[PDB]
Design a protein around this ligand. Structure first.
Ligand SMILES: O=c1[nH]cnc2c1ncn2[C@@H]1O[C@H](COP(=O)(O)O)[C@@H](O)[C@H]1O
Ligand SMILES: O=c1[nH]cnc2c1ncn2[C@@H]1O[C@H](COP(=O)(O)O)[C@@H](O)[C@H]1O
Ligand SMILES: [Ca+2]
Ligand SMILES: [Ca+2]
Ligand SMILES: [Zn+2]
Ligand SMILES: [Zn+2]
Ligand SMILES: [Zn+2]
Ligand SMILES: [Zn+2]
Lengths: 524, 524
């Protein structure tokens, strides 16, 4: 039997440096995790021990920290090249800077193939991008070859900025003919590597005949066999076994996010390319693994431009930006309005005749706003100033919520009002009126929301049965601050852009800001 | 006696082309007025007849039409040079593009002196601008000399964008020592040429010892002796005679605005430079005076780039811009909100620790919004599209109104509601609630306004005795649409930027707009 070791990462999201246990800024070095210098140490160790190794990335290296803000993907090409990745699938966030922000920095500079079989181009873009990404690549491994076939979320137009010259095809429709073609070319060992989420990965393992292994991403899915080594709770065993329509056992793997773990799957194949066995587990990249000194010194050299950028003026405010707890945990605060307005601006996607924009609504825990910004430094706002307001390393995610769920969230917002607790919600595209003299759970007396399916945006009463798109912190999507109803009742969840980066881009665009308190939240 | 003919213009405001009787777009050529080609004909005719002539401009050539938008002052230097102006005073609108937008295009290219005795610079700007404008110039006229001493509104920081490196001194304080200096230099004929308004011009004639004649601007003041030749109603005789503190009779002149008239004042001086007599009248530049063919052909050549610019994309909308009468004369309309938001953005001036901005409030007659803009031309907005929305050639002016006056204006807004009349007001920085079941005059049931004297902008109830700054169309400042209370009760009025240009600059800054209907105007 021919044994292959698959090493894999996904949704690394700009975590070039080691991180805290929750993937935020490293504070206590002796307990920090991940980063590319530590990953290098572990990959090097495995390649010294195992003859047949592939190192794969399932997309979403782009977006997550100031590294991406400043280097715009040049850091991805440089450090993935240094780690000698064998292949990468395109994720949704590889489109955050448009097709031009993908072609240059990443597609032209990567020394490995970049894959997606379900993205097609038209017009002059088709000629410009031809061959810079591939449906698949056949790679030599020892005396054998392995086909790797890519895929990317069909939902990418709603979750990034790919433009109107790319079409994202149904994954299974696009994959099947490519996998059948590889069989005609005597390629009997096939990996599907791609970026659609665990649920789609299981459908691909079930329905795409000839796929031996699925290596996925997007949903930040943690899988594990045995007692978990850290705080992430597994969604299933590692690998997750799907029984295919043709009766094979197909392993499905993912490795959480943020470079905290290295996926590690051993596959035994027979002479005909059938999987005999599969086993493994993600490896926690904790402090017991030393950071490679050479990669660490290069990271520290690249950090100088980040430190310089962090104190540059992004733009100006002519108003005090009130991010005080006394304001933002008790009433509408103009820092809350700014952040929610930045969140909606970040989520303007391709227009369509059925909506002015796909999403119009924002909620934000007031306890997540951690500092004001004074306007008396000649109005200057810097990244360092925003990092004081938003220090947690979160994202502003897209969810679908029934109106009933959102009403329950606004009741929870004020269920114990008056104690300076963090659950009080700041908003955008929502007008709420509370009556605090009513019983907890029955304090919301008006709730109006900005339409999407309209050419002129206007407010209408919230409907209990209707599903709304809402932008909100990942902290709330995951049920933080007691918002268990959001976690338990949401219909869709996709991870969005870095919190600081969303606000910095908005301020840079606007140049001069003056957010008001305007009656989004009232008390009767 | 030595006779001087003073020819003068003021507040020409980018009217390079001939205009309608109301200074808007020329439609019926055979009845059009003004423009630089016609002015050339008349100035040439007078210079053939009168030996001692000066042609003077009292400021505010900048701002008013697409000429300024595109050529940014290069058209002012070119066509004032072609007319051989002898001198110009700086007006407030010469600062609209900052000090850099004054130095280059105008101060470096004018072939005549540009004057202001009450503007001082500090820091590196002082070295950069030294000598490019002058307090005064002594000009030879025949065998004599005449001193011309400039001045500019002390209020310019509130009415334009001069920056924080220029100081505007009290006019009389600055002028007196310059006029006394000219006497020490054997200059006994002195003209004060400047841009502070008729009321300040009369104070200068009264108090500045040695001034023989005041040639002013800013207030668009029409003066005439006899039956007026057109629709402008005179504010007084031409010249207006002030009795000075030293007992001399000092003529004060102005010539309306928009290049419709050429001021014409004959002065007789004795050997010692005392005024013996003064007489004249502005000359209506009507169609009985032919446009100079050479200047007309040059105007037509310069127009090609304006025609090209008028169909270029300024920016995009992702929302229908509802400028329909059915919306904007009956309820809050998102085109109204856009225009008012552009008006406030245009009036962001130098911050100060006593206010976030000096003005926060806007009102706009809904009958002044003349077209929607469809978002389905790939979202494009052009200048031509904005000129359909705002076709009247107006300005967005700054006034001071008591709260009582503004309440009366909001009552008038709905006094005959339901007839699709133009007086219904669109707003910014104001939240109004009407109850139409009440009697006319008592329909306003809530009126809240955005603070200025605050670090965090918020809404408070309007106070009847407090004075508010408001941005509004010149049509309303002049009592149009039956708003007689505004004209009769306002405390201050300064003319602002061209209506189209205000909206075009805002859209260009924003890049992508999505104005909502958000509850600025409600009905109970
Ligand atoms: O990781 C996080 N992300 C976002 N908000 C957080 C996080 N951890 C704490 N918070 C907020 O911080 C509040 C507690 O702050 P404290 O009352 O100042 O200790 C919570 O109620 C949350 O609103
Ligand atoms: O010169 C002008 N400037 C601004 N608005 C004007 C002017 N002339 C007319 N209007 C507006 O046009 C309305 C009349 O439009 P109509 O009902 O469509 O004929 C008036 O009630 C005003 O609101
Ligand atoms: Ca196989
Ligand atoms: Ca004299
Ligand atoms: Zn991701
Ligand atoms: Zn993703
Ligand atoms: Zn003017
Ligand atoms: Zn002026």
């Amino acid at each position: 039997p021919w044994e292959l070791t698959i090493l894999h990462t996904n949704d690394v999201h700009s975590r070039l440096e080691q991180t805290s246990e929750d993937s935020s800024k490293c504070v206590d070095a002796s307990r920090c995790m991940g980063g590319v210098a530590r990953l290098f140490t572990k990959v090097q160790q495995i390649r010294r021990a195992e003859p047949n190794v592939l190192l794969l990335d399932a997309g979403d290296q782009y977006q997550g920290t100031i590294w991406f803000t400043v280097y715009k993907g040049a850091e991805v090409a440089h450090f993935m090249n240094a780690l000698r990745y064998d292949a990468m699938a395109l994720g949704n966030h590889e489109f955050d800077n448009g097709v031009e922000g993908l072609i240059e920095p990443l597609l032209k500079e990567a020394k490995f193939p970049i894959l997606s079989a379900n993205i097609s181009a038209s017009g002059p873009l088709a000629s410009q991008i031809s061959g810079l990404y591939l449906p698949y690549k056949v790679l030599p491994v020892g005396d054998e070859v392995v086909g790797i076939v890519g895929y990317t979320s069909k939902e990418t137009p709603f979750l990034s900025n790919p433009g109107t010259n790319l079409v994202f095809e149904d994954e299974i429709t696009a994959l099947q003919p490519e996998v059948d073609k590889l069989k005609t070319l005597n390629v009997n060992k096939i990996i599907a590597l791609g970026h659609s989420g665990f649920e789609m990965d299981k459908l691909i393992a079930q329905k795409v005949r000839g796929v031996d292994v699925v290596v996925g991403g997007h949903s930040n899915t943690f899988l594990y066999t045995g007692n978990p080594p850290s705080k992430e709770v597994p969604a299933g065993k590692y690998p997750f076994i799907v029984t295919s329509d043709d009766g094979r056992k197909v392993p499905v793997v993912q490795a959480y996010a943020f470079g905290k773990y290295l996926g590690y799957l051993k596959i035994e194949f027979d002479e005909r390319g059938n999987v005999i066995s599969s086993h493994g587990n993600p490896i926690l990249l904790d402090s017991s693994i030393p950071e490679d000194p050479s990669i660490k010194a290069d990271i520290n050299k690249w950090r100088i431009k980040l430190d310089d950028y962090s104190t540059q003026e992004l733009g100006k405010t002519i108003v005090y930006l009130d991010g005080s707890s006394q304001s933002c945990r008790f009433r509408e605060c103009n820092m809350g309005n700014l952040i929610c307005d930045a969140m909606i601006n970040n989520n303007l996607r391709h227009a369509d005749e059925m909506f002015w924009n796909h999403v119009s609504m924002c909620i934000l825990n007031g306890g997540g706003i951690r500092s004001p910004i004074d306007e008396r430094n000649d109005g200057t706002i810097t990244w360092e100033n925003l990092a004081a307001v938003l220090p947690f390393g979160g994202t502003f995610d897209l969810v679908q919520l029934k109106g009933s769920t959102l009403k329950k969230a606004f009741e929870h917002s004020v269920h114990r009002y008056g104690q300076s607790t963090g659950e009080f919600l700041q908003v955008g595209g929502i007008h709420v009126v509370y009556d605090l003299s009513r019983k907890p759970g029955d304090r919301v007396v008006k709730l109006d929301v900005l339409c999407t399916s309209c050419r002129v945006p206007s407010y209408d009463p919230l409907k209990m049965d209707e599903v709304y798109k809402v932008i909100l912190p990942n902290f709330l999507a995951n049920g933080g601050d007691g918002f268990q109803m959001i976690k338990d009742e949401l219909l869709r969840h996709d991870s969005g852009d870095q919190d600081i980066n969303v606000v910095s881009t908005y301020i840079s665009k606007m140049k001069v800001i003056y957010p008001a308190v305007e009656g989004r939240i009232k008390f009767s």
